[PDB]
């Protein structure tokens with residue numbers, strides 16, 4: 001089946017997002033997402049990081065996890081400012097060349113969407129705002145995922 005992988009630094013909300021997507025209807029964490037659009041294997045790579053710094057050790061682990069990935073969900077905090085780790089994971093993803101959907105997390109209220117500007121420059125297109133706490137943007141995220149699964 002199709003494989004979708006979540007990538008991002010620690011504490012941006014990857015496991016929470018993973019859990020919401022897994023429950024959706026219509027070191028790795030692996031789960032089958034199934035809705036009326038079809039099914040795919042969702043993989044969270046957060047457990048591959050030891051600390052919050054992008055390092056060769058982690059990159060090599062992420063590389064393996066991305067082996068047969070069709071789409072990457074690049075998770076960045078939608079409230080906190082972008083970090084050196086974010087910018088480094090972004091460059092790694094551009095180099096990898098796999099389709100990337102930029103996901104802004106913890107966008108609990110529409111007002112937070114006004115402050116996602118720095119995200120548009122990461123080179124991945126408009127970020128899709130989500131909130132696992134309020135279950136926002138999951139429909140839009142599933143639609144984007146399926147537009148890229150061949």
Ligand SMILES: Nc1nc2c(ncn2[C@@H]2O[C@H](COP(=O)(O)OP(=O)(O)O)[C@@H](O)[C@H]2O)c(=O)[nH]1
Pocket residue numbers: 009010011012013014015016017046105106107108130131132133134
């Ligand atoms: N306010 C808010 N908090 C969230 C949201 N998603 C996750 N969190 C919290 O942010 C912290 C890190 O989330 P987590 O999923 O563990 O991040 P990971 O380390 O990327 O898996 C935890 O306290 C989560 O409960 C969200 O959508 N809104």
